[PDB]
Amino acid sequence: FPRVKNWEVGSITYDTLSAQQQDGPCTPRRCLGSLVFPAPEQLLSQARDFINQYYSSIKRSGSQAHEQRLQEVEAEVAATGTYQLRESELVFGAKQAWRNAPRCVGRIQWGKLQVFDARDCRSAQEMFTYICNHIKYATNRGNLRSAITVFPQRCPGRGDFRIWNSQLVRYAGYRQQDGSVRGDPANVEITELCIQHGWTPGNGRFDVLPLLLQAPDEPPELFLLPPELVLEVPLEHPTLEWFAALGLRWYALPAVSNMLLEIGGLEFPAAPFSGWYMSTEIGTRNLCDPHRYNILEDVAVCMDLDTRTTSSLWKDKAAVEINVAVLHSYQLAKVTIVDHHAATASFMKHLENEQKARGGCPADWAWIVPPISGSLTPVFHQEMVNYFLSPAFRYQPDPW
Amino acid sequence: KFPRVKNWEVGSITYDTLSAQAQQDGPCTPRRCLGSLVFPAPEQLLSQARDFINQYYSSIKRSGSQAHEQRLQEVEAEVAATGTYQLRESELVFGAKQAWRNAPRCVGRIQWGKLQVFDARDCRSAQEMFTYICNHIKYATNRGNLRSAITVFPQRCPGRGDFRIWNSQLVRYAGYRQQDGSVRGDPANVEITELCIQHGWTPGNGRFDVLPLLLQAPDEPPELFLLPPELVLEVPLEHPTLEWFAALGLRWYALPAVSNMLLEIGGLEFPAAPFSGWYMSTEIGTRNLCDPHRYNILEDVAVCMDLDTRTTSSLWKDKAAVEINVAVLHSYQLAKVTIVDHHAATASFMKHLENEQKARGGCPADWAWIVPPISGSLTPVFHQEMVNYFLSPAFRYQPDPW
Ligand code: HEM
Ligand code: HEM
Ligand SMILES: Nc1cccc(CCc2cccc(OCc3ccc4ccc(N)nc4c3)c2)n1
Ligand SMILES: Nc1cccc(CCc2cccc(OCc3ccc4ccc(N)nc4c3)c2)n1
Ligand SMILES: Nc1cccc(CCc2cccc(OCc3ccc4ccc(N)nc4c3)c2)n1
Ligand SMILES: C[C@H](O)[C@H](O)[C@H]1CNc2nc(N)[nH]c(=O)c2N1
Ligand SMILES: C[C@H](O)[C@H](O)[C@H]1CNc2nc(N)[nH]c(=O)c2N1
Ligand SMILES: [Gd]
Ligand SMILES: [Zn+2]
């Protein structure tokens, strides 16, 4: 059992949860923890484990209902090769997959998750309808609510449901003749696929992409998001009057749509989930990464900072002011947002809660510590143990 | 078999083949990663010695030469007759530079080939240890134009006590524990402060009292030596546009000189081998001054900057910390004391990574310690995947001598 120390306070816990099912990339000879992407008999083992977790959560372990559900899943796997989750099992499973995600700093919220059951979905058009209801519910006119919509599970001899977009709201990136990008460089690939499937492109820096939705065994189909459904926030700064003139904006709803949800050995390749933004995601990563919008030096130069010498810390000063502008603009627009200080303090509470409830908490230090002001937050001084529990959200290959 | 290592800013990919030579095991397993943890005879010796000698003769392109063959035979005969062996001076120099080159948590390693190595393996007494340490400090400080150096005292030997420096660094500020539980001075040094008082030091009561050295010669109790004030160059902290900042009375010292690590070369162990470079400014401004369990000045600076400290969403913490770091950089430059900011230092570490891929096929690096503690993703190392492993020669943690 790993000993885990908090170096700010000196407190020690032991992770007993890590003893519980998959293997990561590290060995005794070398740590690869910094890498971004590290039978029916096997299905029943994972199914049995999940059903056991569920009957524990509803305080009916070893009960008659518990034994009958295990026998029921065995019988279904024997007759069909797969089995079907009850609605309440799906909800519990989706919440566990969030609770178990090591790279998510927002997991104090894991028990408050609205689950939309879309396992009856038949077509891409129905898929579009479910997604529009999700966006509307989750946005809630700016009072954002975490949600997930679960489309039908994978089954053998039948293609998956897939959302080709990486998120439900994404800005286009148009490759220029010189290699550079107008718009978001992260989305060049999906922008071109949208164009190759017949979308008429724009030419702005913040063009909302259409959805490419794949129903089983069909080519992907294009759907345009109604503009009144996509809430955006113009970026302005509270004292830098010129900041608004830069025309920067971001969208309200972070809705990831390319991960696979795994529950009890069942796989849901299309299960988009959404929360609300932590401000550093927008102000530091999306706007300041050199391979994203890369506007850090544009801002610093307008702040009249000395950008010809690194030791003026112009990069740090401009980055903080862009993060201030994100926080101010979302609060002004009444769109839910959390700064990195408040988010990391809540994650420290989550760690304390999970120590009492499960004996530990899988956490990826490099992803929990925010990308600015790392050691100013309490998670920096907190040792963490990284391991994979199920139910889980997993990366999956692009559908193309 | 070999890990793929990608840079996500540029998309470039390398393979770390150097990791196969990792000799020691780390704390991770396939089932859980522990990379964020701070703290993870004859035939054994001879194979470590042979590997090091082989490394040495490869570094000078004289592999398989008569000199190479003769040295391996000489070491093999020395270990059989004495149970150990002695490094040649050139081997010690190479070994010390290799240990620095191999240190996964050091962002400064672009400098690894430029290291002054003082051979103190003839030292006999604590008084003479003090002479070598003063000469080291004078050479390394160089009136502010800092030069990297290491002094290596005699190796560990069965039946004799170790040379040890009890202090964690050659220059440290005292920490005095108060009644309320708080600390006057540096909370990191409360233990060594009390140890100095228990060996007769008359303590001050300031926030920046330079501690004496506790020096231990073999089989002797530690002996207390006061550093002459002219040896210890210090930098008063001021801020280029916040004029009240200088009135705070903050200062820091020029020379970071770590004295509590063990140097291991070819199976030999040097428990006293203090080394020094120059500061990266976030060590002083973010960690030493703003850590809540250190001097913890962040909120006072924010209040003095007239920032609204009632809500976190003003990012008052971030703004105050950036200005403290500006002050450190401005003050050292004003004092003409070498310093590097975290942008220039991480840019040079990226160059080091490129050099080491060509020279050796990889480079052990600990991502959490290479990425600076403010503005992480504004530096190139943030977007660089890294492989962490243990090579030898190496600097190792070791237990406190008390
Ligand atoms: C409710 C507010 C939430 C906040 C503030 C939040 C915050 C974050 C942040 C900052 C990251 C780092 C992602 C990156 O930098 O790429 C992250 C990752 C992640 N989040 Fe959360 N999140 C929230 C809700 C959710 C929800 C509702 C789910 C799923 C039900 C979820 C699942 C995940 C997963 C799986 C990752 C892993 C990222 C990856 O592997 O690329 N989060 N979260
Ligand atoms: C010359 C300029 C140098 C710079 C800018 C530099 C920078 C740094 C920094 C920022 C750290 C992390 C410190 C922390 O946050 O606790 C570090 C660690 C380290 N440095 Fe360097 N350094 C330099 C020279 C040296 C030299 C000359 C040596 C030895 C010959 C050395 C050996 C080490 C080792 C062994 C560590 C790891 C410490 C640990 O594991 O706790 N450094 N360095
Ligand atoms: N506050 C907040 C809350 C929820 C979501 C977010 C957005 C940040 C985030 C969270 C979770 C997952 C995620 O993205 C997964 C991803 C991204 C790119 C990929 C590219 C290729 C591939 N095969 N998989 C990918 C998976 C982003 N923020
Ligand atoms: N000595 C000096 C030394 C080196 C380089 C320079 C050029 C400074 C510079 C470079 C690039 C762009 C730039 O644009 C400044 C700018 C733009 C708009 C502003 C709006 C409002 C405001 N208050 N300031 C603004 C500054 C400057 N100079
Ligand atoms: N730019 C720069 C250059 C050289 C040195 C520094 C200081 C930062 C640093 C570097 C290397 C080692 C180091 O400290 C090692 C240490 C610290 C505390 C310990 C407590 C107990 C123990 N058993 N070992 C310890 C070892 C600090 N900066
Ligand atoms: C190489 C590095 O591990 C990688 O780029 C990580 C670092 N930490 C991160 N942390 C968060 N929250 N999000 C990220 O995308 C990354 N990227
Ligand atoms: C728990 C965490 O890994 C630990 O506090 C580390 C993180 N990264 C660090 N990075 C540096 N440069 N120095 C440190 O002392 C630490 N501490
Ligand atoms: Gd002023
Ligand atoms: Zn690891």
Side-chain angles (χ1 to χ4, degrees):
Chain A
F1 300 134
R3 177 183 163 280
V4 187
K5 180 159 174 180
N6 177 286
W7 287 90
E8 181 179 338
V9 161
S11 49
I12 312 285
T13 70
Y14 293 83
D15 193 306
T16 53
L17 180 63
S18 59
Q20 285 146 72
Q21 330 136 26
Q22 188 119 140
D23 286 6
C26 299
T27 68
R29 298 176 73 119
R30 79 285 184 281
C31 168
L32 293 172
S34 81
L35 270 46
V36 177
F37 300 109
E41 228 242 44
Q42 147 112 327
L43 175 66
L44 283 153
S45 184
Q46 297 175 262
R48 197 168 272 274
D49 189 301
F50 168 72
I51 295 304
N52 287 351
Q53 295 186 47
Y54 174 72
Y55 277 84
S56 286
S57 80
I58 65 161
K59 310 201 225 291
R60 293 294 186 277
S61 270
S63 56
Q64 247 261 295
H66 184 195
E67 336 234 66
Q68 197 224 312
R69 180 63 179 147
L70 293 161
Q71 273 192 352
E72 187 178 30
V73 169
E74 284 187 274
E76 181 154 33
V77 169
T80 73
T82 189
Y83 72 102
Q84 228 53 224
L85 297 165
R86 281 194 300 241
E87 209 158 359
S88 57
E89 289 164 356
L90 180 65
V91 176
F92 167 83
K95 285 174 187 163
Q96 285 301 109
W98 183 8
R99 180 190 198 183
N100 288 342
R103 294 175 164 178
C104 181
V105 69
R107 280 179 282 165
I108 196 76
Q109 289 285 331
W110 73 266
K112 190 166 196 294
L113 180 65
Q114 174 66 34
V115 177
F116 292 110
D117 188 350
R119 294 173 295 161
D120 47 334
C121 194
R122 285 188 300 96
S123 71
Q125 169 64 49
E126 266 194 276
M127 193 167 358
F128 178 64
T129 303
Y130 272 107
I131 289 175
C132 288
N133 297 335
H134 180 136
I135 289 169
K136 186 175 152 69
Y137 174 89
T139 305
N140 195 25
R141 316 268 286 285
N143 188 10
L144 271 48
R145 309 177 278 197
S146 310
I148 184 177
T149 305
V150 183
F151 293 103
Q153 66 202 44
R154 174 170 290 154
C155 59
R158 188 170 172 276
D160 306 324
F161 284 82
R162 289 299 296 274
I163 307 173
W164 283 34
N165 309 66
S166 66
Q167 298 184 17
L168 295 185
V169 188
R170 294 258 82 181
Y171 293 131
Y174 308 108
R175 179 80 62 188
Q176 306 295 296
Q177 199 163 322
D178 74 341
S180 67
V181 176
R182 185 166 172 79
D184 193 340
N187 305 321
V188 171
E189 239 181 328
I190 185 79
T191 296
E192 253 136 353
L193 285 165
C194 283
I195 299 171
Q196 270 155 38
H197 282 92
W199 178 55
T200 302
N203 48 27
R205 306 137 76 202
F206 304 98
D207 295 341
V208 172
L209 284 168
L211 297 183
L212 265 175
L213 304 186
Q214 175 186 296
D217 297 291
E218 291 280 19
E221 223 181 294
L222 267 180
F223 295 87
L224 255 308
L225 288 170
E228 62 273 16
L229 208 43
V230 186
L231 185 63
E232 288 177 276
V233 176
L235 296 191
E236 70 181 58
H237 188 279
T239 60
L240 293 172
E241 303 166 51
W242 47 261
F243 198 99
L246 297 176
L248 308 166
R249 56 213 272 102
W250 208 260
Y251 49 87
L253 188 68
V256 172
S257 55
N258 59 358
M259 289 186 87
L260 188 148
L261 167 63
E262 187 257 312
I263 297 163
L266 304 181
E267 299 176 321
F268 298 89
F273 57 85
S274 58
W276 53 80
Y277 266 115
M278 181 173 76
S279 48
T280 51
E281 291 178 87
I282 304 167
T284 302
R285 300 308 309 285
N286 301 345
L287 294 173
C288 297
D289 274 2
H291 54 305
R292 299 292 299 284
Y293 279 86
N294 185 27
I295 47 95
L296 189 63
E297 167 142 33
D298 298 313
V299 169
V301 113
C302 296
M303 298 177 53
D304 307 315
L305 304 178
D306 183 0
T307 68
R308 68 202 179 162
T309 148
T310 55
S311 57
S312 70
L313 301 196
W314 60 268
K315 288 181 175 177
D316 314 70
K317 295 163 127 294
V320 171
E321 288 321 317
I322 296 161
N323 279 264
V324 165
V326 169
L327 286 161
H328 165 86
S329 303
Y330 276 65
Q331 288 162 9
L332 184 64
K334 308 256 103 71
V335 175
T336 304
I337 190 156
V338 65
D339 66 72
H340 49 297
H341 303 291
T344 53
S346 82
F347 188 76
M348 295 298 299
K349 191 63 180 201
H350 177 72
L351 288 177
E352 189 185 5
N353 293 340
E354 291 293 85
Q355 193 63 29
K356 287 164 188 170
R358 292 205 290 186
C361 173
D364 184 336
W365 190 95
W367 288 62
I368 296 290
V369 178
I372 54 167
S373 301
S375 66
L376 308 193
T377 66
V379 292
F380 184 96
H381 309 277
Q382 176 64 59
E383 295 177 354
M384 299 169 192
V385 190
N386 196 5
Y387 49 99
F388 177 95
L389 299 178
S390 182
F393 292 107
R394 309 196 307 246
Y395 304 123
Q396 61 186 321
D398 290 315
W400 60 83
Chain B
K1 317 156 191 286
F2 299 108
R4 222 199 74 245
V5 189
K6 171 152 172 173
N7 180 285
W8 290 90
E9 172 184 343
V10 171
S12 61
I13 289 158
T14 65
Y15 296 93
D16 188 310
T17 57
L18 176 59
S19 63
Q21 287 148 62
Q23 302 96 173
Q24 159 91 42
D25 285 0
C28 307
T29 67
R31 293 185 11 145
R32 78 288 184 284
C33 173
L34 287 173
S36 74
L37 266 39
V38 178
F39 295 108
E43 46 267 313
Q44 168 77 288
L45 181 52
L46 269 171
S47 92
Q48 297 181 259
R50 284 191 237 99
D51 175 69
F52 170 73
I53 293 311
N54 286 339
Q55 289 183 56
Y56 173 69
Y57 278 91
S58 175
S59 80
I60 57 174
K61 313 245 86 85
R62 308 292 314 283
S63 307
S65 61
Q66 284 196 19
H68 188 189
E69 311 292 351
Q70 194 276 335
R71 184 59 177 140
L72 289 170
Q73 285 186 15
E74 185 176 68
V75 165
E76 190 170 327
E78 195 167 9
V79 170
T82 70
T84 178
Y85 72 104
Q86 303 296 314
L87 299 169
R88 295 178 173 168
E89 251 197 67
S90 61
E91 291 165 351
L92 179 61
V93 168
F94 164 82
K97 288 171 187 164
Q98 283 306 93
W100 180 14
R101 182 193 196 177
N102 286 340
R105 293 170 161 181
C106 182
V107 74
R109 284 177 277 173
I110 195 71
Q111 288 293 329
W112 73 268
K114 183 155 186 179
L115 181 67
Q116 166 61 21
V117 178
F118 295 106
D119 187 351
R121 293 172 297 164
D122 275 5
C123 191
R124 285 194 197 85
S125 67
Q127 171 65 45
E128 187 173 13
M129 296 181 64
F130 186 56
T131 298
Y132 278 105
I133 286 160
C134 289
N135 280 2
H136 179 137
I137 290 169
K138 206 215 288 194
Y139 171 89
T141 299
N142 193 25
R143 291 180 318 275
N145 184 18
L146 268 42
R147 301 182 281 214
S148 302
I150 182 171
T151 297
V152 12
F153 291 100
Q155 65 201 48
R156 174 171 285 163
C157 162
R160 320 214 327 118
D162 294 338
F163 284 86
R164 291 297 299 270
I165 298 169
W166 282 34
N167 308 64
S168 65
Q169 295 185 22
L170 299 184
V171 187
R172 300 259 70 188
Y173 292 131
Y176 310 107
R177 195 154 285 282
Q178 295 310 126
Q179 59 266 63
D180 38 52
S182 66
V183 178
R184 183 138 171 91
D186 195 332
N189 303 329
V190 166
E191 234 193 320
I192 189 57
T193 300
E194 278 155 22
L195 279 169
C196 289
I197 302 173
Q198 265 145 32
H199 286 81
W201 180 54
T202 295
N205 60 323
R207 296 176 81 190
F208 301 104
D209 298 338
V210 172
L211 285 168
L213 292 179
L214 269 166
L215 301 190
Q216 174 194 299
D219 302 299
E220 301 286 356
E223 195 174 322
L224 205 66
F225 297 90
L226 282 158
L227 289 168
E230 62 268 33
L231 251 53
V232 182
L233 181 63
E234 284 179 277
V235 182
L237 298 185
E238 68 169 50
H239 184 281
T241 62
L242 298 171
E243 278 69 25
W244 48 259
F245 197 91
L248 260 9
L250 303 170
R251 50 173 45 207
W252 207 256
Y253 50 85
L255 183 74
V258 169
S259 48
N260 63 353
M261 291 192 84
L262 182 149
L263 169 61
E264 179 263 306
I265 296 168
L268 307 175
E269 299 174 323
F270 302 87
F275 61 83
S276 61
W278 51 85
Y279 268 117
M280 172 169 85
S281 53
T282 52
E283 299 177 78
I284 303 167
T286 304
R287 302 308 309 281
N288 299 346
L289 291 181
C290 295
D291 267 2
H293 54 297
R294 297 295 293 286
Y295 279 85
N296 188 29
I297 70 176
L298 189 60
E299 153 142 51
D300 299 308
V301 175
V303 167
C304 291
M305 289 168 67
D306 196 31
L307 307 178
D308 187 6
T309 55
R310 295 165 321 191
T311 178
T312 58
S313 65
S314 61
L315 302 194
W316 62 265
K317 276 184 178 162
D318 311 69
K319 299 176 165 194
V322 170
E323 291 316 318
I324 290 160
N325 278 265
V326 163
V328 169
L329 284 156
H330 163 82
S331 297
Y332 275 65
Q333 287 161 8
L334 177 62
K336 280 84 82 90
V337 177
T338 307
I339 192 153
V340 65
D341 67 70
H342 53 287
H343 303 293
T346 57
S348 81
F349 186 74
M350 292 304 297
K351 176 91 258 230
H352 176 68
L353 288 185
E354 180 194 284
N355 293 341
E356 288 297 88
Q357 194 62 35
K358 304 187 190 189
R360 287 212 294 189
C363 167
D366 181 340
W367 189 98
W369 289 62
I370 298 301
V371 173
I374 52 164
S375 304
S377 73
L378 312 185
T379 66
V381 291
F382 185 96
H383 313 280
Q384 179 64 60
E385 289 170 346
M386 299 177 191
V387 188
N388 192 12
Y389 48 95
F390 181 102
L391 304 177
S392 180
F395 293 102
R396 314 191 323 225
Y397 300 131
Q398 61 181 331
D400 288 305
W402 57 88

